[PDB]
Amino acid sequence: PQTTDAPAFPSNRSCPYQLPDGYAQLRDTPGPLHRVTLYDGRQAWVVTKHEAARKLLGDPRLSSNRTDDNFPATSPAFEAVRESPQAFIGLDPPEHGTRRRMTISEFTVKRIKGMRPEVEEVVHGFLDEMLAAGPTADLVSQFALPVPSMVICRLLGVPYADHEFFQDASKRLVQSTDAQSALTARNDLAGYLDGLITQFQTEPGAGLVGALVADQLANGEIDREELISTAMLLLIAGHETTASMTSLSVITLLDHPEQYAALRADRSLVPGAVEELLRYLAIADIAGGRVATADIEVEGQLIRAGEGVIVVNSIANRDGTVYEDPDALDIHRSARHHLAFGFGVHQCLGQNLARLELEVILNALMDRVPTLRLAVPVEQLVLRPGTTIQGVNELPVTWH
Numbered sequence: 138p139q140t141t142d143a144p145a146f147p148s149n150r151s152c153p154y155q156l157p158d159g160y161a162q163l164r165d166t167p168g169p170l171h172r173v174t175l176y177d178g179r180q181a182w183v184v185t186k187h188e189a190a191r192k193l194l195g196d197p198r199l200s201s202n203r204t205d206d207n208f209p210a211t212s213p214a215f216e217a218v219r220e221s222p223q224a225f226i227g228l229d230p231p232e233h234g235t236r237r238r239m240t241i242s243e244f245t246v247k248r249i250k251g252m253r254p255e256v257e258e259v260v261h262g263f264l265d266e267m268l269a270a271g272p273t274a275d276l277v278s279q280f281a282l283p284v285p286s287m288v289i290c291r292l293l294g295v296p297y298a299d300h301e302f303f304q305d306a307s308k309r310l311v312q313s314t315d316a317q318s319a320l321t322a323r324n325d326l327a328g329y330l331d332g333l334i335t336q337f338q339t340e341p342g343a344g345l346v347g348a349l350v351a352d353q354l355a356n357g358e359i360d361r362e363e364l365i366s367t368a369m370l371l372l373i374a375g376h377e378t379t380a381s382m383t384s385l386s387v388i389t390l391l392d393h394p395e396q397y398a399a400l401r402a403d404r405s406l407v408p409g410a411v412e413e414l415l416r417y418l419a420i421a422d423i424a425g426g427r428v429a430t431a432d433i434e435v436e437g438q439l440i441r442a443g444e445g446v447i448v449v450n451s452i453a454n455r456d457g458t459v460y461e462d463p464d465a466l467d468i469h470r471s472a473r474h475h476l477a478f479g480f481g482v483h484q485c486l487g488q489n490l491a492r493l494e495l496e497v498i499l500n501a502l503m504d505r506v507p508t509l510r511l512a513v514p515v516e517q518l519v520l521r522p523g524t525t526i527q528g529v530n531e532l533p534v535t536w537h
């Protein structure tokens with residue numbers, strides 16, 4: 138018999154908005170932790186319950202150091218991160234805070250509020266274009282990706298004129314199935330950002346990269362390679378997460394037409410619906426990895442120093458002790474306290490930007506394209522694997 142008490146992890150989704158069978162199994166198994174086997178045969182722990190996930194994400198004994206040999210890499214592609222200097226996502230205190238603080242001023246509530254006109258312009262512009270062209274369209278390449286791309290590039294000071302290059306590099310990295318393809322995509326982006334830094338040293342300019350070059354880099358308070366990695370992190374996260382939330386939300390909303398109609402009739406529901414979609418779709422388990430630097434006892438189970446732990450926020454978000462009937466999409470529920478953005482010192486820096494983008498995107502689609510519908514059946518879509526950010530390669534749509 139082939140039964141194991143340490144199942145292969147991660148698993149791939151067969152439905153965009155449902156837990157893989159293996160994950161539903163882990164969700165139902167008692168206790169905060171479960172053993173899994175990673176692609177390389179190493180055993181790690183997964184965290185599968187909501188409160189335990191918050192506790193462990195808050196535990197400084199669980200390090201985010203991706204350069205540690207014992208870090209729970211889930212594919213050969215993940216060997217691209219550990220090669221070059223880490224952005225603050227891969228740092229622990231105190232280095233984490235000193236670096237994160239260099240970027241936080243771009244993401245304040247006041248700044249995000251001030252960005253609304255820009256986001257609305259960008260959303261409606263790419264919609265103007267896609268709609269004028271007429272159906273059939275790929276919602277991913279014509280809308281879901283370029284919108285957040287343009288927005289984050291403005292925030293960063295990355296010239297949108299180079300979009301074909303850096304969007305392809307982003308796409309290659311996210312779709313990477315091996316180490317060499319990931320390393321090449323990373324190096325391509327790194328060289329591009331390196332040249333941008335030199336350009337800023339000659340001629341100062343707007344955007345976070347411009348500011349970091351003029352200030353911290355000029356004071357030697359950040360390494361050039363660290364600045365590259367930081368800009369890269371913000372660029373890729375800025376592009377890829379919102380793109381996936383857009384595509385998957387459209388698919389999910391169209392599969393729940395009663396809720397989608399309700400959303401259209403009462404736009405005050407949009408912010409709450411965005412939270413529920415974030416909870417339900419939980420696109421970023423790829424960002425729950427940790428390595429124990431000391432023994433941690435968790436409700437009778439022992440995590441040993443040197444063991445990998447992955448906090449699986451999609452499974453945690455389906456904890457029925459927190460969300461009644463957790464596998465039901467309910468745009469009227471309180472999806473508050475969800476872990477789609479993590480918890481603690483590494484909680485998503487871009488979360489409020491993401492929330493603004495998704496609110497504007499959903500309102501715009503309901504306003505401008507009320508007849509939007511998929512042009513192929515949901516079953517024909519190709520979902521990305523559990524080793525990357527959740528999403529679809531392409532999303533064929535049509536409308537009146």
Ligand code: HEM
Pocket residue numbers: 201225226227237289370371372374375376378379382415419420421424425426450476477478479480482483484485486487488490491
């Ligand atoms: C759209 C939905 C998004 C989801 C579901 C999401 C998810 C996550 C998660 C789970 C983490 C925690 C990683 C960890 O604990 O190791 C994270 C961190 C982070 N995210 Fe987001 N993200 C989204 C959008 C964005 C956007 C639009 C940006 C803009 C740049 C962004 C930038 C970041 C950064 C810089 C971090 C690292 C924070 C730190 O380590 O201190 N994310 N995100």
